[PDB]
Amino acid sequence: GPLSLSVDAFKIDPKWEFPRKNLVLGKTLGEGEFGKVVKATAFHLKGRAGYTTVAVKMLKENASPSELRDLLSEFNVLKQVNHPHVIKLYGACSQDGPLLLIVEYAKYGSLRGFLRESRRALTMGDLISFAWQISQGMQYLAEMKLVHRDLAARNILVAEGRKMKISDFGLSRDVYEEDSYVKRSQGRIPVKWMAIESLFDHIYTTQSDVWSFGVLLWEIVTLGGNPYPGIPPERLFNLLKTGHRMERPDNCSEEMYRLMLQCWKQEPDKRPVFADISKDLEKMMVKRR
Amino acid sequence: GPLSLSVDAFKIDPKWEFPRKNLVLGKTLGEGEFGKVVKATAFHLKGRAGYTTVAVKMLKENASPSELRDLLSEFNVLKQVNHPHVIKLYGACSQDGPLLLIVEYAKYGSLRGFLRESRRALTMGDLISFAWQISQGMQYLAEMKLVHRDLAARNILVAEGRKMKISDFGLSRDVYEEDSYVKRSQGRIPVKWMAIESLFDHIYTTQSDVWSFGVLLWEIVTLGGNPYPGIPPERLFNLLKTGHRMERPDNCSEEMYRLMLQCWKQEPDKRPVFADISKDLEKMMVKRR
Ligand SMILES: Cc1cc(Nc2cc(-c3cnn(CCN(C)C)c3)nc(Nc3ccc(CC(=O)Nc4cccc(F)c4)cc3)n2)[nH]n1
Numbered sequence: 001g002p003l004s005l006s007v008d009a010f011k012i013d014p015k016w017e018f019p020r021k022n023l024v025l026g027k028t029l030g031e032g033e034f035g036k037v038v039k040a041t042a043f044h045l046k047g048r049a050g051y052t053t054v055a056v057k058m059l060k061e062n063a064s065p066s067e068l069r070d071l072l073s074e075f076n077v078l079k080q081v082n083h084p085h086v087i088k089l090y091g092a093c094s095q096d097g098p099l100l101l102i103v104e105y106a107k108y109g110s111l112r113g114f115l116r117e118s119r120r121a122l123t124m125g126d127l128i129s130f131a132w133q134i135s136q137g138m139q140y141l142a143e144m145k146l147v148h149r150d151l152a153a154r155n156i157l158v159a160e161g162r163k164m165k166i167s168d169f170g171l172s173r174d175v176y177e178e179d180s181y182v183k184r185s186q187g188r189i190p191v192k193w194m195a196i197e198s199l200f201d202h203i204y205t206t207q208s209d210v211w212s213f214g215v216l217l218w219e220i221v222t223l224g225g226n227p228y229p230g231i232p233p234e235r236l237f238n239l240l241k242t243g244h245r246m247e248r249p250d251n252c253s254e255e256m257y258r259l260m261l262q263c264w265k266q267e268p269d270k271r272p273v274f275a276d277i278s279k280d281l282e283k284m285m286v287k288r289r
Numbered sequence: 290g291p292l293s294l295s296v297d298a299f300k301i302d303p304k305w306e307f308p309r310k311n312l313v314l315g316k317t318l319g320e321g322e323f324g325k326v327v328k329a330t331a332f333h334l335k336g337r338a339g340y341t342t343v344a345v346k347m348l349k350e351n352a353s354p355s356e357l358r359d360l361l362s363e364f365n366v367l368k369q370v371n372h373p374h375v376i377k378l379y380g381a382c383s384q385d386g387p388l389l390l391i392v393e394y395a396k397y398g399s400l401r402g403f404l405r406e407s408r409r410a411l412t413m414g415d416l417i418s419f420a421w422q423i424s425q426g427m428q429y430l431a432e433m434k435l436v437h438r439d440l441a442a443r444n445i446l447v448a449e450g451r452k453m454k455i456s457d458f459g460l461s462r463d464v465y466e467e468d469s470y471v472k473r474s475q476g477r478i479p480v481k482w483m484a485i486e487s488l489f490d491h492i493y494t495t496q497s498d499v500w501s502f503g504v505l506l507w508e509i510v511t512l513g514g515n516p517y518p519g520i521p522p523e524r525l526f527n528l529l530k531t532g533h534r535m536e537r538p539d540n541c542s543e544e545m546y547r548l549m550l551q552c553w554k555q556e557p558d559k560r561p562v563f564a565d566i567s568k569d570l571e572k573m574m575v576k577r578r
Pocket residue numbers: 029030031032033037055057103104105106107108109110150154155157167168
């Protein structure tokens with residue numbers, strides 16, 4: 001079937017193969033979508049003499065076919081994209097042991113954990129700078145005809161210099177032909193981040209990510225808050241279609257909240273595009289000086 | 290879409306509704322397939338005066354549509370089956386809070402944890418008695434035209450008197466019409482427990498469960514061992530089709546190992562049925578006396 005053909009295709013791309021003897025695994029940083037993330041160090045990686053610190057994405061115990069397929073999908077997307085605000089890929093280990101992906105290591109970890117451990121001194125301007133970088137990256141992925149589908153604070157990484165990096169591409173899909181990706185079965189993205197049409201019609205486009213980007217903005221202004229607090233995920237069906245959205249979060253400007261509301265418009269065509277979301281954030285920072 | 294129609298259908302079955310004020314949640318026993326399992330106590334449950342200890346299956350934080358659909362599926366199967374070796378359902382809480390399923394509590398927990406914490410004095414006969422009960426239960430589910438699809442040691446519960454209970458019905462499906470369930474997308478069952486045709490053709494029948502029952506027998510004789518030890522799950526594709534199986538585990542009889550091999554025959558029709566798997570286990574115990 002489909003997965004057995006992909007796996008065999010892998011065992012056959014030398015520019016990405018890395019010897020296993022030069023890889024040393026370390027502590028478990030956390031549990032990913034299709035497995036576990038591990039801190040490691042690589043010797044003579046990509047012509048970089050000496051050891052280099054890196055992160056390894058691998059399958060955990062009792063991996064299912066969907067998790068294996070998701071690991072192969074992320075490897076196929078990362079080796080195509082290149083942008084300062086998207087996690088960089090270095091290689092993979094496919095022979096003489098389990099399947100490993102070698103990616104960039106981010107000092108400060110995920111954006112959610114970085115924010116929940118702050119009040120760290122962070123101003124409103126730095127919060128706007130973070131969102132701007134994320135829009136610069138999503139603007140680049142959309143131009144490559146890709147839908148992330150799982151855009152949230154936990155899927156963003158914070159590297160040296162507080163530079164955002166979009167990560168976790170396991171659920172990403174290509175949409176060059178139809179401009180949309182449709183899933184017949186039930187998806188595996190958290191409900192509270194999904195667009196209304198994605199939740200009801202299983203349609204995923206570049207405008208569905210705009211919805212998720214509005215929830216991500218809500219997470220940032222609330223410094224790692226949980227969306228729709230105190231609402232069972234099974235109730236969002238009747239709440240969203242009736243026209244209800246999250247209320248004004250404290251420590252938020254009327255312009256920031258208005259930008260969120262526009263990302264949550266029922267009609268996808270009425271929602272803004274990433275190119276315009278950047279201009280809005282851009283002017284929100286030049287005025288507060 | 291499909292899930293939004295099921296959820297609305299739920300909010301409309303009084304014989305299973307239980308008031309929330311009579312439910313008191315406790316410690317987290319563990320993390321389930323679609324969420325978390327919690328130890329609780331229910332007041333005046335099913336005409337049983339006083340408090341009764343129970344287990345609650347609920348959605349965890351950031352639940353996805355697939356996890357919600359799986360919670361609704363288990364609720365639909367459990368309210369149809371009734372057998373001494375299948376977990377019993379008591380009710381559910383659907384109004385005035387999150388979605389909860391109230392099921393039977395098993396003193397000793399899962400069969401895997403029960404075995405890994407033993408050497409507890411367990412003989413070969415008691416190991417045969419455990420497998421026999423599990424076959425009695427699967428024989429009853431097959432007669433109801435149901436495929437469990439996720440039969441393993443962690444999905445079995447051990448109750449008072451060391452009586453087995455088949456649990457975790459989230460991935461179970463009905464097969465009354467076609468006698469088989471086919472999944473177009475990639476499944477979510479651990480590879481090392483899947484039948485070869487399930488892994489390649491995405492076909493699930495009552496004979497696919499026999500394959501999984503043979504791996505479960507391997508877990509029991511090895512007292513909670515991990516199948517195919519030291520083999521990446523992505524390699525099972527080429528290993529299974531080439532005709533390789535797990536080797537003779539120590540502390541195992543030639544008849545017990547031969548029963549396993551028959552559950553692993555490539556041709557599903559050549560594999561035995563549960564009615565015959567019981568007779569084999571039955572005579573394996575009357576002779577060792
Ligand atoms: C892949 C990668 C990781 C990194 N770097 C780091 C650094 C740190 C870190 C924390 N503290 N300190 C040092 C501070 N100390 C001293 C207090 C460093 N932590 C992490 N954890 C970590 C971050 C992201 C994920 C992926 C993920 O969540 N997937 C997922 C999960 C669930 C659902 C879903 F949809 C997707 C996994 C784990 N990662 N770079 N590249």
